[PDB]
Amino acid sequence: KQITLYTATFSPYAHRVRIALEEAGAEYTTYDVDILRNMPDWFPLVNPLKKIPAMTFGGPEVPPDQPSPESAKIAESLAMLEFIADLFPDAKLLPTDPVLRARARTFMALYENYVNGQFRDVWFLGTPADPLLQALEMLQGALPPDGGFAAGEWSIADAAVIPFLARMFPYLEAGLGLYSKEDGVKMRKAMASERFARIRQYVRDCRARPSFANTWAGDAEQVEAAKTVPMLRVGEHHHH
Amino acid sequence: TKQITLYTATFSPYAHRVRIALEEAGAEYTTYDVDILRNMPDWFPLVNPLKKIPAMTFGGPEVPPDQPSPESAKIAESLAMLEFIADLFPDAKLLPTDPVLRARARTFMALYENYVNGQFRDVWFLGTPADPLLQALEMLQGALPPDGGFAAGEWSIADAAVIPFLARMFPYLEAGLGLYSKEDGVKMRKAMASERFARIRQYVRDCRARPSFANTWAGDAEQVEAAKTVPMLRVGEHHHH
Numbered sequence: 170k171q172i173t174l175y176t177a178t179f180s181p182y183a184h185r186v187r188i189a190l191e192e193a194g195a196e197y198t199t200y201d202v203d204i205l206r207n208m209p210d211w212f213p214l215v216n217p218l219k220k221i222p223a224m225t226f227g228g229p230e231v232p233p234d235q236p237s238p239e240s241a242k243i244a245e246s247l248a249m250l251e252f253i254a255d256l257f258p259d260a261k262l263l264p265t266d267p268v269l270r271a272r273a274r275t276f277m278a279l280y281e282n283y284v285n286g287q288f289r290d291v292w293f294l295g296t297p298a299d300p301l302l303q304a305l306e307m308l309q310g311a312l313p314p315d316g317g318f319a320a321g322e323w324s325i326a327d328a329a330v331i332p333f334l335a336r337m338f339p340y341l342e343a344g345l346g347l348y349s350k351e352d353g354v355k356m357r358k359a360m361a362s363e364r365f366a367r368i369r370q371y372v373r374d375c376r377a378r379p380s381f382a383n384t385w386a387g388d389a390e391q392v393e394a395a396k397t398v399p400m401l402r403v404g405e406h407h408h409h
Numbered sequence: 410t411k412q413i414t415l416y417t418a419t420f421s422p423y424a425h426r427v428r429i430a431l432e433e434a435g436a437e438y439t440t441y442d443v444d445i446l447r448n449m450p451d452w453f454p455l456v457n458p459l460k461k462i463p464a465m466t467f468g469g470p471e472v473p474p475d476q477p478s479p480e481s482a483k484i485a486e487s488l489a490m491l492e493f494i495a496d497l498f499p500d501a502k503l504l505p506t507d508p509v510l511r512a513r514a515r516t517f518m519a520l521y522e523n524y525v526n527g528q529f530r531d532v533w534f535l536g537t538p539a540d541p542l543l544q545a546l547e548m549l550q551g552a553l554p555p556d557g558g559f560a561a562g563e564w565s566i567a568d569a570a571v572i573p574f575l576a577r578m579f580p581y582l583e584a585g586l587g588l589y590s591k592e593d594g595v596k597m598r599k600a601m602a603s604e605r606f607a608r609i610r611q612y613v614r615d616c617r618a619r620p621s622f623a624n625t626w627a628g629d630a631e632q633v634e635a636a637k638t639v640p641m642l643r644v645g646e647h648h649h650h
């Protein structure tokens with residue numbers, strides 16, 4: 170059954186699913202959608218929520234811009250990650266041990282419930298960075314301190330999280346986001362300090378896998394794509 | 410055979426999720442109440458460093474819940490616990506086996522967590538406008554199978570994730586609990602009784618009728634009283650827009 174992923178280069182949520190599809194060894198199509206500036210009028214047929222990513226599964230082979238009513242329509246990136254693990258059990262995208270699987274699910278929930286909203290506050294509103302650094306230290310603490318991925322072996326938990334952490338460093342270097350230069354310097358200094366050595370190792374380890382290289386446009390190219398995001402307000406910063 | 414201990418509180422819809430799943434699994438388990446919002450025990454960070462309910466311990470030697478063992482696995486986050494219980498009890502069929510039906514369950518949980526839950530929190534605790542909550546609830550209702558049944562068809566952990574919040578909404582509205590305005594209270598009570606929301610009313614009745622709900626619910630009046638102990642539900646305060 171065919172897999173089509175509707176994607177966009179700037180989107181960390183879409184990036185999650187591309188990484189998982191690479192790790193699964195899946196056959197799949199990607200189709201870019203200019204969702205924030207010029208959504209195609211047919212896109213609500215694949216996702217009535219009008220969000221990227223969207224996925225179609227099965228149905229007749231059709232061009233991505235002529236989606237079939239017969240394909241299954243799957244929404245929400247984390248549901249897609251679990252779906253890919255279910256479709257490709259031999260790829261071991263989750264552990265088999267229940268406790269190790271729970272480490273993976275807990276890590277995803279920690280990111281979604283405590284970290285992502287802090288990234289949104291800082292990058293979209295320019296609120297103070299300390300709560301974000303606090304949340305990142307908490308997430309770092311859930312990693313195995315001596316090395317490895319969130320659940321030991323690589324799992325969909327790492328697909329869920331690396332798109333956001335990998336964007337953080339080059340976005341900061343570009344000063345992209347509503348935070349002030351002062352908070353930018355503070356974040357860059359903190360993320361380079363020994364306080365965050367472990368999460369730097371995590372980002373390197375995830376980025377070294379082919380699933381990341383094959384789904385990443387390059388730091389400079391990803392920064393340029395992010396500048397097209399309306400809510401990142403390129404050129405704008407809030408102060409105090 | 411490994412022991413399960415769930416640290417719980419009657420008001421908490423997040424802990425309620427996990428009690429429902431444990432009932433559906435037929436698991437042997439212990440519950441232990443924790444006064445997390447008014448008087449957290451000094452030992453509680455040993456079972457959850459995030460200092461949130463629910464918390465779960467798994468395995469380790471059998472010990473009293475207020476003397477937790479370092480040897481037990483410490484599991485945090487209610488939705489992680491739901492998937493864990495499905496993993497521990499595969500014969501209970503707490504998820505479908507078909508991948509697309511399983512994705513329906515996972516998508517339903519994500520729709521609730523990402524678009525509905527924050528609206529419930531903001532309307533009840535901050536008194537933000539009710540219309541965005543009603544729109545999110547209409548969207549969630551549209552994900553249900555139209556002719557009846559549960560989120561993924563057969564009952565699954567997706568329904569354990571969602572019913573604690575929907576089941577509290579109706580009696581909380583009737584008891585006037587929450588910081589939203591009188592006007593928005595009237596609007597929500599009318600909407601939730603209107604034909605627009607017939608499908609989600611059937612869904613709530615269907616989930617509540619299962620023994621897993623009856624055996625984990627203190628009764629409407631009792632749950633309302635437990636909710637009044639929540640410090641953020643400041644009696645006599647309302648926000649207006």
Ligand SMILES: N[C@@H](CCC(=O)N[C@@H](CS)C(=O)NCC(=O)O)C(=O)O
Pocket residue numbers: 179180181182204205219220221222244245246247523
């Ligand atoms: N919870 C969703 C988030 C998806 C999301 O927010 N995608 C953004 C792009 S990064 C989008 O399409 N926004 C359009 C909109 O929200 O209207 C998921 O995990 O897939």
Ligand SMILES: N[C@@H](CCC(=O)N[C@@H](CS)C(=O)NCC(=O)O)C(=O)O
Pocket residue numbers: 282420421422423424445446460461462463485486487488
């Ligand atoms: N995302 C958590 C939410 C848990 C949560 O917020 N629990 C509340 C009780 S309903 C709590 O323990 N609050 C204490 C605190 O935030 O300090 C989960 O799904 O388990």
Ligand SMILES: [Ca+2]
Pocket residue numbers: 551552553
């Ligand atoms: Ca529908």
Ligand SMILES: [Os+3]
Pocket residue numbers: 180181398
């Ligand atoms: Os975005």
Ligand SMILES: [Os+3]
Pocket residue numbers: none
């Ligand atoms: Os709470």
